[PDB]
Paper text:
Hemoglobin (Hb) and myoglobin (Mb) are the key molecules in animal aerobic exercise, as they are responsible for molecular oxygen (O2) transport in the bloodstream and its storage in the skeletal muscle, respectively. In the present study, we investigated the molecular evolution of whale Mb by experimentally resurrecting ancient proteins. The analyses of their chemical properties and structures demonstrated how Mb molecules evolved to adapt ancient whales to deep-sea environments. The atomic structures of the synthesized [name], aMbWb’, aMbWb, and swMb were determined by X-ray crystallography to 2.4, 1.6, 1.4, and 0.8 Å resolutions, respectively.
The seven residue replacements; namely, E27D, V13I, T34K, D53A, Q116H, K118R and N140K, were deduced to have occurred during the evolution from [name] (terrestrial ancestor) to aMbWb (aquatic ancestor). From [name] to aMbWb’, V13I filled a cavity in the hydrophobic core, T34K added a hydrogen bond, and K118R (interacting with another substitution, E27D) introduced an electrostatic interaction on the molecular surface. Unexpectedly, log S0 decreased during the evolution from [name] to aMbWb, and remained almost unchanged from aMbWb to swMb, indicating that the total solubility in pure water has not increased during evolution. The consistent results between experimental and theoretical evaluations indicated that the observed solubility should be an intrinsic property of the Mb molecules determined by their structures. ΔGsolv increased during the evolution from [name] to aMbWb, whereas it minimally changed during the evolution from aMbWb to swMb, indicating that the single-molecule solubility in an aqueous solution rather decreased during the evolution. However, the resistance to the precipitant (β) significantly increased during the evolution from [name] to aMbWb’, slightly increased from aMbWb’ to aMbWb, and remained almost unchanged from aMbWb to swMb. The folding free energy changes from the intermediate state to the native state (ΔG1) and the total free energy changes from the unfolded to the native (ΔGfold) slightly decreased from [name] to aMbWb, whereas they significantly decreased from aMbWb to swMb. In order to verify the significance of the observed molecular properties of ancestral Mbs to the deep-sea adaptation, the PEG sedimentation and chemical denaturation experiments were also performed for extant horse and cow Mbs, and compared with those for swMb and ancestral whale Mbs. The precipitant tolerance of these land animal Mbs were similar to the terrestrial ancestral whale Mb ([name]), whereas their stabilities were similar to the early ancestral whale Mbs (aMWb’ and aMbWb).
Author numbering: 0 to 153
Amino acid sequence: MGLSDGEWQLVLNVWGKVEADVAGHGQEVLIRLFTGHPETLEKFDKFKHLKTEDEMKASEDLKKHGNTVLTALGGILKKKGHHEAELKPLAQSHATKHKIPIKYLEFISDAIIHVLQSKHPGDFGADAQGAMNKALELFRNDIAAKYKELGFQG
Ligand code: HEM
């Protein structure tokens, strides 16, 4: 499940593109998640009512939350397989009040690979897509281990 140094280099390289506009990337990721998987939308009190891509873009809160999501994920990814320190608070909040199924983690991960493909193809070739998919599977897997401790499944 671990990533090779090469795979980590592929991940960090593309994250460099996200670094320039974390909020804007986060916005596009959530929009991709919400449009492809509308049931995910139901887990956000604030966004449950945004029916359209224009409405989602018009939401300042959605963009700000997008920033929040990718800022955290950025933290995890730059730690490269020594990341459980930032995972605990993430697992804790996605498995208690919220209750976010692992499969929704998969979906946002797909949304992430999709946005990076579209926006940064020259920095996201096959191996890099492979490596990011791995980094993100590792992340879900680790969170899912913490979900059990937190007593979450359903
Ligand atoms: C890479 C995946 C994700 C990351 C890094 C992430 C990160 C975060 C962070 C940092 C917060 C705010 C503080 C906290 O609660 O820990 C948060 C809150 C939240 N997360 Fe996530 N999240 C991810 C995936 C998801 C998904 C897929 C969903 C639901 C479909 C979700 C649902 C929520 C909700 C509903 C909140 C509170 C929203 C609010 O009050 O605005 N998260 N998440």
